[PDB]
Symmetry: none
Subunit: 99 residues, 14 copies
């Protein structure tokens, strides 16, 4: 009863190798990001509103604007990022050369 | 009953190698970020509002603006970041050469 | 019953190697950041408002602006960051050469 | 029942090596940052407001502006950071050469 | 029942090595920072306001501005930081050469 | 039941080595900083205001500005910090050469 | 039940070595700083205001400005800090050479 | 939109009369009793247990006894309560005699 | 929108009369009692337990006894309460005799 | 929007009359009693326990006895309470005799 | 928006009359009693325990006895309370005789 | 928006009359009593214990007895209280006789 | 917005009359009593204990007895209180006889 | 916004009359008593203990007995209090006879 990602559970010998997120001449934007997160036997409440109550004995109008989580206005621009000749962006996980 | 990521649980021999987030000539922006986080047997409340109450015996209007979590205005710009010739951005996880 | 990330639990021999976040000619911005955080058997309350109450016997209008967590105005700009020839940005995790 | 990150729990021999956050010609900004933090059997309250009460027997308007945590105005700029030829930014975790 | 980061719990032999935060020609700014912090069996209250009360028998308007934690105005600028030729910024964790 | 960071708990032999925060030609600014802090079985109150009370039998307006913790105005600038040729900034954790 | 950082608890032989905060041609500023602090079985109150009371039988306006902890105006500037050729800033933790 | 019991809502003339719970030579017992109760726009939690958690890495048995509300042992006895001759127990709601 | 019990809402003339709980030679017992109670726009928590946690790395048994509200042992006895001749217990709500 | 019990809301003329709890030769007992109680816009916590935590690294048994509200041992006895002849217990709400 | 019990809200003429709790030859006992109580816009905590924590690295047993509110041992006895002939216990609310 | 008990809010003419708690030959006992109490905009904590902590590195047993509010031992006895002939206990609220 | 008990708020003419607690041949006992109490905009702490801490590195047993409020031992006895013939205990609220 | 008990707020004419606590042949006892008390905008701490701390490096047992408020031993006895014939105990609130 094992839960895992990117690995080995029961092996006499093992190798885990990785190369991630190599960037050259890049423009990036993000509102909310979650990377490498584990939840085990826990509660979680994010961007939550419980109760809304609007009561009036006499009035003209009543309105309500309620929101849990909101993301607006994400922009990314890139112009002429790479111009040099012979630019190289390489990523390798595992190189094995034995004699 | 093991929970894990990027590793080995039961192995006589093992190797864990990684190279991450190599950046050259980059522009990045973020509102909220979470990396390498573990929750075990815990509570969590982030960006939460519990109760909203609006009561009036006599009035003209009533409005409410309620929000848990809000992110606005994220921008990234890059211009002519790389111009030199022969620029190299390399990432490797594990190099094994034995004799 | 072990919870872990980037490691080995039960192994006769083991090696853990990593190289992370190598930056050259970069511009970065962030509102909130969390890296390498562990929660075990704990409470947590961040950006929280419990109760909202608005009561009036006689009035004209009533409005409310309530927010738990807010992030605004994140910007990053990069211009001509790299111009020298033969610039190198390298990251390696583990190099093994034995005789 | 062990909780850990970047390490070994039960191993006859082990090695933990890391090289992190190597920066050259960089501009960085942040509002709030948390790195290498452990919570065990503890409470935590950050940016919290408990109760809001607005009561009037007679009035014209009533408004409220309430916020738990707020971050505004984060900016980073970089210009011509690197111009020298043959600039090198290298990061290595573990180098093993034995005879 | 051990909780740890960047280390070994039960091993006959072990080595822990690290090189962190090597900076050259960098400009950095931060509002609030937390590094290498442990909480065990403790309370914590940071940027908190408990109660808000606004009562009037007769008035015209009533407003309230309440905030727990606020960060504003973080800026970083870098210009022509590196110009010398053959600049090197290197970081290594562990070098092992034995005869 | 041991809680620790950057160390070994139960090992016949062990070595802990580190080199941190090597800076050359850098400009840094911070509002609040916490490094290497331990809390065990303790209370903590920082930037806290308990109660707010505003009562008037007759008035025109009433407003309140309340804040727990505030940080404003953090700036860092760097210009032509490094110009000499062959500048080196090196950091190493552990060098082992035995005969 | 041991709580520690940067050390060994139960080991026949051990070595703890560190080199930290080596600076050359740097400009730094900070509002509040805490380094190497331990709290055990203690209370702590910093930047706290308990009660706010504003009462008037008859008036025109009433306002209040209350703050627990405030930091403003932190600036750092560096210009042409390093110009000599062959400048070296090195940091090492442990060098072991035995015969 | 009227909700009521034992009464009149819209009537030019009305009469409400009642005689309740007339007891003679009686024995009564009760565990929990609720009489004449109104709930309007409210929450209510009585005899509630939220969460049950039983976790063991190694053990022999584990059992749990959980209960929300429990009533036990209610008894009533009456013997020869009434022996006098001509005992009367009368109840009347409304007697109207007009001339 | 009126909520009521034992009364009149909109009537030119009205009468409310009642006679309740007339007791003679009685024995009564009760554990918990609620009479004439109104809840409007309120919370309520009575006899509540929130969380139960039982964790063991190694043990033999573990048991738990949890209860919200408990009532035990209610008894009432009556013997020869009434023996006099011509005992009267009368209850009337409203007697109207007009000339 | 009126909430009431035993009364009149909108009536030109009205009468409210009551006679309650007339007792003769009675024995009564109670654990907890609530009579004539109003809750409006309020919180309430009675007989509550929040958290239960039982943790052991090594042990033999562990048990817990937790209770919110408990009532035990209520008894009432009556013997030969009334023996006189011609005993009267009368209750009337309203007697109206006009000429 | 009126909340009331045993009364009149809007009436040209009104009368409120009551006679309560007339006792003769009675024995009464009570643990806790609440009569004529009003809660408006208030908090309330009665018989409450917040947190329970039991932690042991090595032990044999651990038990806990926790209780919020407890009532035990309520008894009432009456014997031959009334023996005189022609005893009267009368209660009247309102007597109106006009000429 | 009026909250009241046993009274009139808006009436040209009104009368409030009451006769309460007339006792003859009675025996009464009580642990805790509350009569005629008003709470408005206030806090209240009665019989409360906040935190329980039991920690041991090595021990044999550990137990805890915690209680918020406790009432024990309430008794009332009455014997031959009334023996005289023609005893009268009368209670009246309002007697109106006009000419 | 008026809160009151046993009275009139807005009436051209009014009368408030009461007769309470008339006792003859009575025995009474009480542990704690509260009569005619008003709380407005105030705090209140009665019978409260905040923190409990029990820590031992090595021991055999540890126990704790903690209590907020405790009442024990309340008794009342009455014997042959009334024996004279023609004893009268009368209570009246308001007698109105006009010519 | 008036808070009151046993009175009139806004009335052209008014009368407040009361007769309370008339006792004949009575025995009474009480531990703590509060009558006619008003709290407005004040703090209050009665029978409170803040912190409990028990720490031992090596010991055999440790126990603690802590109590906030305690009442014990309240007794009342009455015997043959009234024996004279024609004893009268009368209480009246208001007698109005006009010509």
């Amino acid at each position: 009863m094992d839960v895992f990602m990117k690995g080995l559970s029961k092996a006499k010998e093992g190798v885990v190798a990785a190369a991630e997120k190599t960037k050259q001449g890049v423009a990036e934007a993000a509102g909310k990001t979650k990377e490498g997160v584990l939840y085990v036997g826990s509660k979680t409440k994010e961007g939550v509103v419980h109760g809304v109550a609007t009561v009036a004995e006499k009035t003209k109008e009543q309105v309500t604007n309620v929101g849990g989580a909101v993301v607006t206005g994400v922009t990314a621009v890139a112009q002429k990022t790479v111009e040099g000749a012979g630019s190289i962006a390489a990523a390798t996980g595992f190189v094995k050369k034995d004699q």
